[PDB]
Design a protein around this ligand. Structure first.
Ligand SMILES: CCCCCCCCCCCCCCCCCC(=O)OC[C@H](COP(=O)([O-])OCC(O)COP(=O)([O-])OC[C@@H](COC(=O)CCCCCCCCCCCCCCCCC)OC(=O)CCCCCCCCCCCCCCCCC)OC(=O)CCCCCCCCCCCCCCCCC
Ligand SMILES: CCCCCCCCCCCCCCCCCC(=O)OC[C@H](COP(=O)([O-])OCC(O)COP(=O)([O-])OC[C@@H](COC(=O)CCCCCCCCCCCCCCCCC)OC(=O)CCCCCCCCCCCCCCCCC)OC(=O)CCCCCCCCCCCCCCCCC
Ligand SMILES: CCCCCCCCCCCCCCCCC[C@@H](O)O[C@H](CO[C@H](O)CCCCCCCCCCCCCCC)COP(=O)(O)OCC[N+](C)(C)C
Ligand SMILES: CCCCCCCC/C=C\CCCCCCCC(=O)O[C@H](COC(=O)CCCCCCC/C=C/CCCCCCCC)COP(=O)(O)OCCN
Ligand SMILES: CCCCCCCCCCCC(=O)SCCNC(=O)CCNC(=O)[C@H](O)C(C)(C)COP(=O)(O)O
Lengths: 459, 124, 84, 70, 178, 303, 88, 128, 175, 52
């Protein structure tokens, strides 16, 4: 596993020793090479796992997330290249350092053979994200946003730590393999109920759950474009990975305890999809769409069936790519208009046709058009939930309809109609932005050719 | 249909219900009670794999119509005699079904009249 | 290649209410003391090739005569051929 | 791909003889087809097999005894 | 559309508008030309009976029962011209209308073709640059104090002057750009 | 509108029920629901059609009525006949849309029939093509619509179905004849009503060839396909004489009734419309209420 | 489309044609600049009917606010040219 | 007389059927005049900013900023706990959750009872 | 074709009729298939022959991996991790094999349904019964383990089912 | 009113259907017992079809 970790660490001295006008080129080239190296982890087995050492192991749940994490960094650099032009070299290097530290923390988090190491890195991801949000954000609300994004997380994660050490005092180990092989049923007791809650809520706050989703619109709207991408694409999936890893020790208490969270997610996907219909903000709309999709992923994980796990894995990967692309498109609009309001810049298909094509493809893949992997995950989760209970289909159909409605609403409001007359500073799209959208969208349509690569360890 | 009018605006007991027909034993009318005949056996009618609803007593003419349609293919108007034969066989089947309907109706009317006569005799 | 042939407008004195249902409208309007000031403007709709109309059944029977002639010719040929 | 025809301004538009002859030919063809099919196959509209009258069937063929045997 | 609106509609304007609407909807009801002509002269005769009416209270009582009568018999599916705000081609070509300033963002290789057009465009830009500086002072001196009361713009009064705020009225894309 | 929303895409749902006919035939409740849905759809859409002024709207409502008839055919457990109707309707409805588009283009993008008058002589090829298409749609013996629609009517009459469904199917056939003759009368027969500058022109080989290919189709395809496909269902060989002609007599009765009702528009008499006309013209008021009451009550809540 | 590119002369010709078919107007006394209210003694209703005639002749509809202030054939021609973007 | 048109929320009163416009008073005329004056002042400001050749970028609109700020960031500071607000929040935020919980719990209880008794006929049910 | 076993994927003898031309009119199908053969099948066959001889010029082989049998979860001590690991791996391999067996039976069923045409309800009862039995066995083995399934959970389910079976048999005998 | 009348009339038509003066269709081999479901090892009750 060190063949990926060491180059990521070496990205820092190279960035700090690079010439004042060659930081972006070096960082992009070497990040792309690191992603190419990380592609080798996709060769998994139907047997246990890829146990590299006592500290790091891989899995077909970990490998797609690792590949996405490595692939996201060059796109983040390419999108940050624009608005950091008037920045001093030291501060640009600091921004790249924050991105590299975030990538290293995520890489070490996703392997993490042990639960306390997983917790340490899972919280270590907080600091670079907080600094990025609160230092390179534009508005005055960023500070407030940062506070929310911090404390919510800790409010869920400090109990988890307690539970974790408690488990190591009883079981004797926190290794994932030993935990799986020596798992014992949880007696239906109040102590076990609160242990379940402590183990679960830390990851449910990061998805986020419908009741605990308030920090996400603030953090997404206020963060810079790279922060928004890393929040929507990878950081939301940490909670799903944690629940998938930790639900093994919670059986059979999950059957009773899952009802409140299942109700919250099944109604919150409808609520947030309806919220998306009446939104004056593009970033807020994309954030609420992310909330709805992760509510569906929460339902999938809670149902705890093989089809649920496969669909959840596919949906996390697909949503990461799609949400990052949508945020990039909105940022390209904002860098021209400087307002970030949907209704102001209109009729953009007439002025930027290729960007309109990118918008159409992104909206189609967010709308879960088959045979995209978005649709594969959606359909697998829906089938598993139907097997769970036949009345879920009503809520899922409502969610699908509202999702299509608000996706096409966002596309039509910005791309179609008549252009705003007084807005005259809309320059032709650059090669950088078009390449960014192409690099976002091509992996999705390539992955729809080989879905089993992102269907998880239960395939 | 006129039978619908007679059943829905008249009384129910005079005319049959198509769901439960027949409600009387076959040889209740006459005792010889000949059996319906079949030409196509199981094997060749399965081999021609006609359809489940097409496997009736008129199957043989359908077999020959299909044989014509397969043999003289480009001349799709060559074999018209067999279409007429199959139509005639289905016509005979439908006529027999109508005769069965009328026979059941007349038996029901006769039973009602016999019951009324018995009731009148008891009353007197 | 476009239609640049310098088309000239017809004579305005050509259009007369006479011979059209606009006359009948004028006669009914005179019985109450009224007159139409735009009667001649709409006369061209009844003047040229638009003067002669066709009925619904006539429209349905667009090619019945030729079809019937061909039908009888073909029937005669078939009758004279099969009788051999 | 057609020929040059100029607007008319309140007169009947110019007619090409080709379109008139084609339309008349197709209408005549349709009517000839209808008449030919009616002559050769008149039974698809009028019906070939007579509809039997249930009231004309005697009680002997229908299995009816004179109300005293059974 | 082109002319500026007024603060209110006078009585005669309302009467003329109702006459227009009633005639259009009667034409929609009466498909054929002779029938429409007959009923249109009848409606005009019914209109002109109260032409010389002088009581303004009675005049307001009139035209109001008339609007109610029109609303009762208003032909729920009236004929609309194709390019009118209800027509089937109202904004068909609005997607082909591109702003003039987009030409400033063209590549020099694109401007290499059509050189005469861009020369004339440069002349237009020079004219606009001078005329706007004249127009600002013209409008500032001509405007009443406290702000305008009607959104009507004055014409040019000098020799080399141009009408104030002319650029975006003259340089409309087209009615059918493509 | 001619390719997607008239003949190919819209039949897809019907085609879906044709794909699962082994399972549809083993359930009686779903069959009854399909039959009732088809009957109400065809009746309502024909009722809306008989009073429209946009030609494209009339043809679209005709398409919806035909889809309802296909659903009725599926509901009476006759899927192959529904497929045959799909195939014939493709031809003649596509041609009808071609003719409507030709009329629209020749009249400077004018779609209202109130502004098109005498086109029987002004444009003869479109006239004859649309006449042939209308005769195929209403059902003329031995045309392409005959081999499908006549069998549909016979099967519906000869089956253990709803009385209401049969009644609505017959009324829908009469209304089909009604809107066909409405289009003919208000687009081809009267005096011209378009703007004075005449730009009528058909002499383009593309339009003529495209229309004439579908003309040959709508004339001969029904016969050739019906006589070339193998038999897949038992026929209604013996049938009452009066009920054998019911589809016909309904068609002519609708023809004459709508023709007589249209001929009174020439009279110099005017009256305000009734409630039935208003209900039929505004599409049963369904698009109004259902596009204002739910959406608002949704969107408001969403905020 | 295949619509000939109408010109100012054609527009003026059609406007004068429609006005000359208006029998309330003596054709030999009308002119391009002839006023409607005073030079021709026409009512306001007559002016609106002329607006109907122009609308039905040219196939597009003039808004009431613009139409009610059109009193000469020349300015009607100019308005229609401005609407239709006529070069010459 | 004719049947009366009854306005509704989703089908408002026609402009020409209002009782208000027919009642004209000098005060109403002054109100209309000053409304047109405000509209014309705004239009003049916008057109002066719009026709400027030196102008680049977007003409910032205070009304749009006010609209977005009032819709998003002015809600909670102006919020007040009220019986209407408390009741509506409790209903719309709790009732759906408990309703759906009751529905799903009842459905799964029936399913569990049926599978316990064995009369569920789960043949060919292999993927879940 | 020798590429697959005929016993694992059985097929009927595939009897086909003989052409019986009742008319002298020449059908378009035979001429069309002859011209198709000449214009398509021959060049494809020649290209395949070239490719096959090129493959024959370079021949190499690969082998199907064989796995030894290992003590299963029943012969494992309560906390001895090595034997539990081996038993779990063996159980997962057996699970995959059973999945493939069910796949094979389903393929048989689908091929039957398509092949027998209009008489599939009667001519494919054997495959239906085979799939019913195999599905019943597979469902008894793995129906309700859920995610995080293990050999221990499967063994516990089997023990519960066999305890129920033993109790039912005892009650029936003692009824 | 239109929708409610439609629903009520469809229910009424379901309660009073339309059919023909014919008996049930007759199928030869024990109502096609062997080729509809199969199960040949049970020998069902034979059915005799009337000749008329
Ligand atoms: C259909 C089969 C095609 C196979 C041929 C191979 C095609 C390869 C294309 C790969 C994907 C394209 C990449 C996306 C970015 C767009 C590229 C671009 O910049 O355009 C510039 C380029 C130049 O145009 P321009 O004039 O310079 O610019 C003018 C403006 O841009 C104005 O732009 P515009 O208005 O011209 O819009 C461009 C156009 C195209 O742009 C797009 O929107 C592309 C997006 C398509 C799908 C959207 C996401 C939905 C999820 C589907 C995922 C399936 C992927 C399969 C594998 C993909 C492999 C990479 O938009 C559309 O037409 C809408 C397409 C909606 C299709 C909905 C149907 C979905 C299912 C289709 C079947 C797929 C599986 C079938 C399996 C069963 C049968 C075997 O335009 C194109 O080249 C158009 C591309 C061709 C149309 C593709 C539409 C369907 C293809 C789906 C994926 C391939 C299917 C694989 C085998 C199927 C058999
Ligand atoms: C068993 C024996 C078999 C033989 C049976 C007898 C033989 C035939 C006898 C004739 C029977 C009637 C035929 C004439 C139809 C009427 C035509 C007519 O005069 O229209 C002008 C006239 C008014 O015209 P207007 O307003 O002055 O328009 C001005 C211009 O003319 C505007 O004109 P435009 O230029 O705009 O367009 C003209 C257009 C515009 O005209 C229209 O507005 C059409 C609207 C009415 C005609 C539609 C009749 C179809 C009825 C379907 C009903 C389905 C159930 C609905 C249930 C609703 C529940 C509330 O008219 C047309 O295009 C032609 C109209 C259609 C006639 C051709 C086909 C109809 C015959 C088939 C009907 C039944 C026979 C079935 C055949 C099989 C044998 C079983 O229409 C009527 O007065 C309506 C008469 C009948 C309507 C019945 C519905 C009334 C419902 C009231 C409430 C009832 C209580 C419900 C309680 C619910 C509480 C829960
Ligand atoms: C804010 C947005 C959402 C945030 C996250 C919300 C999700 C967390 C909700 C936790 C789920 C429920 C907690 C406990 C569930 C146990 C089941 C219990 O509720 O049912 C009955 C329990 O009865 C009563 O519920 C007893 C508890 C009553 C006191 C709890 C407070 C109830 C409402 C408080 C909700 C506030 C949550 C947020 C706190 C800040 C069953 O009766 P009994 O058989 O005897 O108990 C079985 C359990 N045993 C065997 C261990 C004994
Ligand atoms: C996003 C913000 C939400 C915050 C998360 C809140 C949920 C977490 C649950 C609250 C904290 C509990 C931590 C428990 C740590 C696990 C250890 C454990 O479970 O062991 C139990 C310990 O169980 C407890 O002590 C629980 C006591 C809880 C004290 C603090 C309560 C905090 C508030 C609880 C109310 C909220 C409950 C639902 C919260 C859901 C989130 C909103 C057994 O103790 P022993 O004595 O060693 O066993 C021997 C006897 N059988
Ligand atoms: C199908 C829809 C039905 C519609 C029904 C409509 C009802 C029709 C009946 C209308 C009733 C009236 O006349 S309402 C009568 C209202 N009262 C007056 O009109 C008095 C003074 N009239 C004017 O001043 C006008 O402007 C005038 C002199 C006409 C022109 O002036 P010009 O010199 O500047 O052209």
């Amino acid at each position: 596993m060190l063949k990926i970790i060491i180059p990521t660490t070496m990205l820092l001295p190279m960035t700090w020793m690079s010439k004042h006008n060659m930081i972006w080129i070096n960082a992009t080239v070497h990040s792309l090479l690191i992603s190419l190296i990380s592609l080798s982890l996709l060769n998994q087995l139907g047997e246990n796992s890829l146990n590299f050492s006592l500290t790091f192991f891989s899995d077909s749940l970990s490998a797609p997330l690792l590949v996405l994490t490595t692939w996201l960094l060059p796109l983040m650099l390419m999108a940050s290249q624009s608005h950091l032009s008037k920045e001093t070299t030291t501060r640009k290097k600091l921004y790249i350092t924050m991105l590299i530290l975030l990538q290293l923390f995520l890489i070490m988090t996703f392997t993490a053979t042990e639960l306390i190491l997983f917790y340490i890195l899972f919280e270590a991801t907080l600091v670079p994200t907080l600094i990025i949000i609160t230092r390179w954000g534009n508005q005055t609300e960023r500070l407030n946003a940062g506070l929310y994004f911090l404390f919510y997380t800790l409010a869920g994660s400090l109990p988890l730590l307690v539970a974790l050490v408690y488990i190591q005092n009883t079981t004797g180990s926190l290794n994932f393999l030993i935990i799986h092989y020596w798992s014992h049923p949880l007696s239906n007791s109040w102590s076990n109920i609160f242990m379940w809650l402590a183990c679960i809520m830390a990851f449910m706050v990061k998805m986020p759950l419908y009741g605990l989703h308030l920090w996400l619109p603030k953090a997404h709207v206020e963060a810079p474009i790279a922060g928004s991408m890393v929040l929507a694409a990878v950081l939301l999936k940490l909670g799903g990975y944690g629940m998938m890893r930790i639900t093994t020790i919670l059986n059979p208490l999950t059957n009773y305890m899952a009802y409140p969270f299942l109700m919250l997610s099944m109604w919150g996907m409808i609520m947030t999809s309806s919220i998306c219909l009446r939104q004056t903000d593009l970033k807020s709309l994309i954030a609420y769409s992310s909330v709805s999709h992760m509510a569906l992923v929460i339902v999938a994980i809670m149902i705890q069936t093989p089809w649920s796990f496969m669909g959840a894995t596919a949906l996390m990967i697909a949503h990461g790519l799609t949400s990052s692309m949508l945020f990039c498109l909105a940022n390209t609009n904002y860098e021209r208009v400087h307002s970030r309001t949907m209704i102001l810049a209109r009729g953009l298909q007439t002025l930027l046709p290729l960007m309109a094509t990118w918008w159409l493809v992104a909206s189609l893949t967010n709308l879960a058009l088959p045979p995209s992997i978005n649709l594969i995950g959606e359909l697998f989760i829906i089938t598993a939930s139907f097997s769970w209970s036949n009345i879920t289909i009503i809520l899922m159909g409502m969610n699908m309809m509202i999702t299509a409605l608000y996706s096409l609403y966002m596309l039509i409001t910005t791309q179609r109609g008549k252009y705003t007359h007084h807005i005259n500073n809309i320059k032709p799209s650059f090669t950088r932005e078009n390449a960014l959208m192409a690099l976002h969208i091509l992996p999705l349509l390539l992955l729809t050719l080989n879905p089993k690569m992102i269907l998880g360890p239960l395939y | 249909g006129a039978h619908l009018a007679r059943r829905y605006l008249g009384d129910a007991s005079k005319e049959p219900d198509p769901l439960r027909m027949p409600t009387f034993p076959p040889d209740y009318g006459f005792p010889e009670r000949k059996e319906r005949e079949m030409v196509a056996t199981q094997q060749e009618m399965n081999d021609a794999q006609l359809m489940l609803q097409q496997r009736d007593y008129c199957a043989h003419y359908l077999i020959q119509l299909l044989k014509c349609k397969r043999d003289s293919f480009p001349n799709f108007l060559a074999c018209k005699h067999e279409q007429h034969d199959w139509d005639y066989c289905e016509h005979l089947d439908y006529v027999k079904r109508m005769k069965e309907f009328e026979r059941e109706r007349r038996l029901l009317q006769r039973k009602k009249r016999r019951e009324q006569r018995e009731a009148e005799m008891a009353r007197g | 290649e476009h239609g640049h042939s310098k088309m000239e407008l017809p004579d305005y004195k050509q259009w007369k209410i006479e011979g059209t249902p606009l006359e009948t409208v004028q006669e009914k309007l005179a019985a109450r003391g009224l007159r139409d000031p735009w009667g001649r403007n709409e006369a061209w709709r009844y003047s040229g090739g638009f003067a002669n109309n066709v009925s619904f059944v006539g429209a349905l029977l667009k090619g019945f005569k030729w079809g019937f002639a061909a039908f009888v010719v073909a029937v005669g040929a078939e009758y004279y051929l099969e009788s051999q | 791909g057609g020929v040059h025809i100029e607007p008319r301004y309140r007169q009947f538009p110019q007619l090409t003889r080709s379109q008139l002859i084609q339309a008349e030919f197709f209408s005549a063809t349709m009517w000839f087809w209808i008449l030919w099919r009616f002559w050769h196959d008149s039974d698809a509209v009028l019906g070939h097999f007579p509809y039997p009258d249930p009231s004309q069937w005697t009680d002997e063929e229908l299995g009816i005894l004179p109300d005293d045997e059974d | 559309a082109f002319s500026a609106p007024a603060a209110y509609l006078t009585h005669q304007q309302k009467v003329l508008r109702l006459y227009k609407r009633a005639l259009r909807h009667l034409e929609s009801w009466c498909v054929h030309r002779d029938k429409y002509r007959y009923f249109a002269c009848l409606m005009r005769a019914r209109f002109d009976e109260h032409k010389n009416e002088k009581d303004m209270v009675k005049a307001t009582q009139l035209l109001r029962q008339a609007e109610e009568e029109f609303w009762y018999g208003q032909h729920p599916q009236p004929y609309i011209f194709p390019e009118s705000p209800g027509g089937t081609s109202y904004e068909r070509y609005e997607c082909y209308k591109v702003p003039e300033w987009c030409l400033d963002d063209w590549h020099p290789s694109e401007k290499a073709m059509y050189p005469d057009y861009f020369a004339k465009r440069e002349q237009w830009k020079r004219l606009r640059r001078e005329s706007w500086e004249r127009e600002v002072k013209q409008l500032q001196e001509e405007t009443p104090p406290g702000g305008p009361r009607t959104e009507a713009l004055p014409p040019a009064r000098k020799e080399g002057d141009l009408p104030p705020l002319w650029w975006h009225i003259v340089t409309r894309p087209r009615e059918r750009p493509m | 509108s001619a390719l997607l929303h008239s003949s190919t895409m819209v039949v897809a749902g019907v085609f879906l029920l044709i794909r699962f006919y082994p399972l549809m035939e083993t359930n009686k409740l779903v069959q009854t629901m399909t039959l009732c849905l088809g009957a109400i759809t065809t009746l309502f859409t024909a009722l809306c059609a008989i009073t429209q002024n946009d030609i494209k709207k009339i043809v679209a409502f005709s398409t919806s009525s035909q889809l309802g008839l296909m659903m009725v055919t599926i509901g009476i457990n006759q899927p192959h006949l529904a497929f045959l109707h799909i195939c014939m309707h493709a031809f003649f409805k596509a041609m009808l849309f071609m003719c409507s588009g030709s009329i629209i283009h020749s009249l400077n993008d004018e779609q209202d029939i109130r502004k098109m008058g005498g086109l029987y002589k002004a444009m003869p090829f479109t006239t004859t093509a649309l006449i042939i298409g209308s005769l195929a749609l209403t059902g003329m013996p031995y045309l392409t619509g005959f081999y499908s629609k006549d069998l549909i009517i016979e099967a519906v009459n000869m089956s253990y179905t709803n009385a209401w469904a049969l009644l609505m199917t017959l009324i829908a056939t009469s209304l089909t004849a009604a809107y066909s003759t409405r289009i003919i009368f208000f687009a081809f027969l009267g005096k011209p009503r378009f703007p004075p500058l005449v730009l009528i022109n058909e002499n383009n080989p593309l339009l003529i060839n495209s229309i004439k290919r579908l003309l040959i189709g709508s004339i001969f395809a029904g016969f050739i396909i019906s006589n070339n496909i193998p038999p897949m269902t038992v026929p209604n060989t013996t049938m009452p004489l009066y009920m054998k002609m019911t589809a016909l007599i309904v068609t002519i009765m609708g023809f004459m009734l709508a023709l007589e009702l249209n001929n009174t528009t020439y009279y110099l008499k005017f009256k305000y419309p009734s409630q039935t006309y208003k209900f039929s013209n505004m599409l049963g008021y369904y698009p109004s209420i259902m596009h204002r009451l739910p959406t608002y009550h949704n969107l408001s809540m969403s905020q | 489309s295949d619509a000939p590119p109408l010109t100012l002369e054609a527009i003026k010709d059609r406007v004068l044609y429609v006005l000359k078919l208006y029998d309330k107007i003596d054709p030999e006394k009308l002119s391009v600049n002839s006023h409607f209210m005073k030079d021709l003694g026409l009512d306001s209703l007559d002016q609106v009917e002329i607006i109907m005639a122009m609308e039905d002749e040219f196939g597009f509809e003039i808004p009431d606010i613009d139409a009610e202030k059109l009193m000469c054939p020349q300015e009607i021609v100019d308005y229609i040219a401005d609407k239709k973007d006529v070069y010459e | 007389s004719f049947p009366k048109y009854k306005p509704s929320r989703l089908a408002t009163l026609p402009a020409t059927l209002d009782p208000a416009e027919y009642d004209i008073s000098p005060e109403t005329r002054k109100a209309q005049a000053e409304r047109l004056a405000i509209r014309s002042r705004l239009k003049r400001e916008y057109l002066l900013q719009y026709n400027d050749p030196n102008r680049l970028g977007v003409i910032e609109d205070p009304a749009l900023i006010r609209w977005t700020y009032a819709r998003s960031a002015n809600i909670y500071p102006n919020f007040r706990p009220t019986p209407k607000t408390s009741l509506l929040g409790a209903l719309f935020g709790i009732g759906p959750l408990f309703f759906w919980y009751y529905v799903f719990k009842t459905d799964r209880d029936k399913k569990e009872k049926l599978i316990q008794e064995g009369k569920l006929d789960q043949t060919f049910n292999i993927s879940y | 074709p020798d590429s697959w076993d005929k016993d694992v994927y059985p097929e009927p003898p595939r009897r086909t009729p003989a052409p019986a031309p009742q008319t002298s009119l020449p059908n378009p199908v035979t001429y069309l298939t002859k011209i198709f053969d000449l214009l398509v099948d021959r060049p494809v066959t020649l290209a395949r022959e070239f490719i096959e001889q090129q493959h024959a010029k370079n021949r190499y082989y690969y082998y199907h991996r064989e796995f030894r049998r290992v003590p299963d979860i029943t012969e494992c001590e309560e906390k001895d991790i090595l034997c539990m690991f081996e038993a779990e791996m063996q159980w997962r391999r057996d699970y995959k094999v059973d999945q493939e067996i069910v796949n094979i039976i389903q393929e048989r069923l689908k091929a039957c349904q398509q092949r027998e045409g209009e008489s599939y309800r009667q001519n494919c009862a054997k495959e239906l019964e085979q799939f019913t039995q195999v599905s019943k066995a597979f469902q008894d083995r793995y129906s309700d383990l859920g995610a995080h399934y293990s050999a221990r959970k499967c063994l516990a389910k089997q023990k519960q089912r066999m305890l129920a079976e033993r109790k039912a048999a005892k009650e029936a005998a003692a009824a | 009113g239109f929708v409610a009348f439609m629903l009520f009339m469809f229910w009424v038509g379901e309660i009073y259907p339309s059919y023909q003066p014919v008996g049930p269709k007759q199928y030869p081999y024990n109502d096609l017992y062997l080729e509809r479901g199969g199960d040949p090892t049970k020998e069902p009750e034979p059915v005799v079809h009337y000749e008329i």
